[PDB]
Amino acid sequence: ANVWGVRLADSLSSPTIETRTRQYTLHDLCSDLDANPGREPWKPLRNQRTNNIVAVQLFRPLQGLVLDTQLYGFPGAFDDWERFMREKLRVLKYEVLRIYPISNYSNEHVNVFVANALVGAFLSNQAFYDLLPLLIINDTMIGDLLGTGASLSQFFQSHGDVLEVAAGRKYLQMENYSNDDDDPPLFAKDLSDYAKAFYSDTYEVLDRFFWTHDSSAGVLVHYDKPTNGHHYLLGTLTQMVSAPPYIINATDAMLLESCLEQFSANVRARPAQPVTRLDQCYHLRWGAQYVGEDSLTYRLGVLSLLATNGYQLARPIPRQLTNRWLSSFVSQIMSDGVNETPLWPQERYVQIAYDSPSVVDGATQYGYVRKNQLRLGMRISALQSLSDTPSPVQWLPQYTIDQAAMDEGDLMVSRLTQLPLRPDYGNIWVGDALSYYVDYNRSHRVVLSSELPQLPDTYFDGDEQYGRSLFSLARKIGDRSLVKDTAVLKHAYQAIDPNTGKEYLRSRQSVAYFGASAGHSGADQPLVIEPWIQGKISGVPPPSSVRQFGYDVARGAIVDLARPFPSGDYQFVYSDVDQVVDGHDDLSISSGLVESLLSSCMHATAPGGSFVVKINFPTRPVWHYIEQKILPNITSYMLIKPFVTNNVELFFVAFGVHQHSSLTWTSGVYFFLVDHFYRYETLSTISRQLPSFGYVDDGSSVTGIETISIENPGFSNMTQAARIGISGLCANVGNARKSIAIYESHGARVLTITSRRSPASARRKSRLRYLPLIDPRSLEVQARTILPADPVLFENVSGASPHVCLTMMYNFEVSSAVYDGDVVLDLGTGPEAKILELIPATSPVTCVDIRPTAQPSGCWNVRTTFLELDYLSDGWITGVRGDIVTCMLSLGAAAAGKSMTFDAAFQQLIKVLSKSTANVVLVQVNCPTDVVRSIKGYLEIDSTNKRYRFPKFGRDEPYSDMDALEKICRTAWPNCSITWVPLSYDLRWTRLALLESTTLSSASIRIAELMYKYMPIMRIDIHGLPMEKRGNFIVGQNCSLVIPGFNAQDVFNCYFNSALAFSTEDVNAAMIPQVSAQFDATKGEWTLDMVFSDAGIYTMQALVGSNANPVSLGSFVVDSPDVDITDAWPAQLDFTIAGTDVDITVNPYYRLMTFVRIDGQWQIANPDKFQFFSSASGTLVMNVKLDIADKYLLYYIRDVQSRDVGFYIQHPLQLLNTITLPTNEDLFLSAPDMREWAVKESGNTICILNSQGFVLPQDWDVLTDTISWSPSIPTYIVPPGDYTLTPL
Amino acid sequence: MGNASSIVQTINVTGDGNVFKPSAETSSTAVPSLSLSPGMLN
8 A cells, every 4th residue: 555655555454462561669669770791770872883872761760850961070982871870879879778677578569659759859869757647658649649739739630530740751861862864753741841741530521621721732642551541631831843854742752653563563563572652643632623624633643543554564663663764654645645545543442344354342441433335455474574686686677467558658768767877888799809810831822912801991981990999998807018019929939840840949049129108007118018028927938138129218228210320130029019109190191101110110120030010001012022122032921910909900920031032922921911901890880889888868869778767656656657667668678688776866766777779679679559558566576675785887807608609699690680571480499488589570470489478469561470379299389470480598408308319309399390381491400510538628529429519508419410400401401492590709799798787798799709619600591502412521631512403604612701712614713722613514513622611601602693682592611620549659769859759640630739737827948858750761759858847737639720739739748657767867857846846865855946945956957948847947857766756 | 265374264175065056047257248338428
């Protein structure tokens, strides 16, 4: 229910059992005066923020202080007050004990009025010797005092047979009290005279008395169990002014205190816990001639009666009340609304409804009347208390069958919204960076300088700059120069010379850093220099010296580096000069600057040296100049691009300068550049559609936040306005995470609802014709507090999991496949019906699922049907309408649930789909499109029993092969076209993540790519063009295609990752090792013979006649060679500098390197320890220098050929960890790690390597160059003996 | 129907004092049909 703005719960509670009373004896009074610790007649009240005692509550006695406070001479602080009170009460006890000895007066009933009056007169310093003879009752408490007369008129006054006594305080203020926001309310009970009490023995006499007495201020009475017998209470004109902005007189304050006590007692009620009184509320009997309907007294009476009948507040009542809480409650009481309850106060008596749980009418004997025809429909149950949630909580809404017009929903959303506001943005890309590189290889074909791609002509547009800046401002990473330099250096130091067999770059060589910058990080130099010198970078041995040059340097020389200047020769040159400063915003001038920088770096380098240059804008003139004036003068080159932000920058590395050669651009460089530009174009298109970094949200941008706020919610009987507003918010952001919060702000209770919108939400919105309303039960149940939180656009702070990326790839493919106005048959849709946001807004959909759906049914605009039945069963496919069929991430789980092989499941699915009317089938399939390998931690493959295991989810599914599925489909549809949708290497699906306020990382993307390698999407086109595969589609082998149904004038062309692999118009101009094409007229067939070089998925297209629209064929998959590797060791080892040579067998296609695992990281072993070369018969030989430390390290062999490392080959060398050290030779020794190790000879310890107090033994010898993975760790030569290292 | 229990209730399905006494003058209809002819409604 709801009453004038006060929300009420939907259940009723009440106390059940009263507690009996004990009378008050002289022993009890003496004990009360004793005031022993823990039993005192007072109790302190503390400020809720500072925690200082600010007031005290007075129990019995000390309920008689009715004079001005300066008359008692009280102290100011709590402790002084305690001491003063104890000392005075002790003397009072002795004075009262002199009259009534405890020996024969210990069990006698004492007059409460006389006790209170005696204490007050003692403390106020007036005569009380007329009070002691009345201490012990003789007939009745009131009868003894009604007859005394005017002698004691200072305390008691008798108007015949009714005794008037002035009400005493129940609270007392200390000096700290300051009307603070956190001080406890005292309800005007701390004043001199807030009220007067009239005691009699019967109610009729009291009514007769009050007939001829004033009653305008209002008369209150307890009916259940009054304190000192029957009495009426009359309020004076004193007021409470501690609850701003309100001023409350005595009557309303007393009513309010009683009402709150009753509500709190209602909430915490048990059937077997006695309470002092079953009804703590006051009733106003005489004086109700002067109550206005809009007054506070009328509504206080309504609340009092409601609390009597068992109602509960929806908000939590604090254990100790404070002024802000009371002010908020009173502000809620006076708001707008009506009393929805069927209970209205009436002067004559109190009403108890028939369904009320209170049993007060049976406890008492006069005052409460039960109404039979008055009924309440409510469950009887007490509230369950909960603590307040510090952050907003999620909320899943559920829709009823109600409907409304969309326009009214938009109007209510406009009314309730809290926009505009400035939120926090967050980061759109977090985590570590990766690198993509290409090198020179002679197995590729020759590419001229005009076939190479160039940067887009619109690179410098205003919105392009906006996109680049937005991407750069919202990516979290460390110093970018350090990352780029580390990647480039680690790539450069491991290139192998062709004719000598060593690395180009070696340790202890001169280095020149051109373009070094101080920077405003306090280092005053490039960061990567410092570790490089100390050898903290594995695989990068330190140089002899480093010299810095540039305009903005701090520890070098300021010089213009494009013109001759005095400087010697250097064996390695690293350039990082940008072409922006000197180049006057003209592109050709920047290209000329690149040329001059290349000439300068060529002159500065000694013959046999090496250099690195950075290019900001790769243009075709630059490629031509490099081709004509540099390449015929170096030995080898490579290109690197460490991806930190969205750029077209590139690094060019030249090895072996000042030497003749015949180097040319190759096809691999063409592929590298094509993908390098495509990735930038896609990411720019995505990131130009995001809001500005630090914008103000008005609701106008497609991507943004939405929020609404409602004051004093009315969930119980929600008016259509609030329900329509909440439904409008739900319609704007559908299928997005939603949060709610309930909190107090400025004397109100407020509900706030927040979510985020997106283009998918707009698409789902455009499909509605009406507005489906929600079920408000979940909100009206809530009876707690949830504190709010700051709004942030990108709430996620870690990056999407690879499973989410795989699902986004599948969803993007589904969205792209469906054109406009095409009937869709979706199989296995979830309850939430994601498909409604992917297909366009004019395409009818039929979702088939075994589980019941959650989406509403009558609000939609076009056909939208949901069916509850398994899709692999027969008897239903004849009667559905569809053309494109979608089944994603459902077939494997369904086949595992029924415990059948994947072949049988696919056969059954194709059987049911044969009888349909579909044209295109899109099925997510469990089948490998490469060699079978396991992704540790995310997917494991069991080949003997074909079985995919998913450890992140603890799930299991079967799988099959391409041959079986292709044979099944070719049997079902004799002329279909099967394609394997290529989603690897493509970044378009990211449009479904960054535009939904979701944060991505690069490593998760790579994991998703590697998982999609084994779970492709098979797309079958029913009426397609048959073609046949003949050879073994393996890298390097001969593979053939047989294509029918074409003439002698037709043209073919193949595509490999958005780059034209080859064509038939110009056969020799291809980028594939060997292609040939023949035509046969009698069979009318095209025969294509090919030899491939790179594994992947290739697509084919055909051009017929003069048509401008090309007809698309299927696609095929080209696989990598075998991954079986082995090693063989000689019988007699070698422990000298020459080392031992082991013969290893592996396919020549792979490039091998050796690594080691340290603290969960991968580190490159030294090139001084392992050397790979070839023998006469071509057998691969590996030369290794055996080390004692190798008894405690495990070395791995991994392939480094492609962008991934270690996915195809990861071979541990076991026989290196199990060598037997000779006892009569000189051995190499080195510290295995950075920990301290103890070296022991025959159990006699020698020294502790890495210890601070380590001194070299006299007979040990040092090695000129180390063989340890860490270049900082030195190598020693140890004499004959057997040694052991223990990791201290 | 069925049997149940509540702490406070208004009617007793399984209790005493209920009447079941079909009559001709009482009968039982809800809304078998309504007249919604196209000629009448315009």
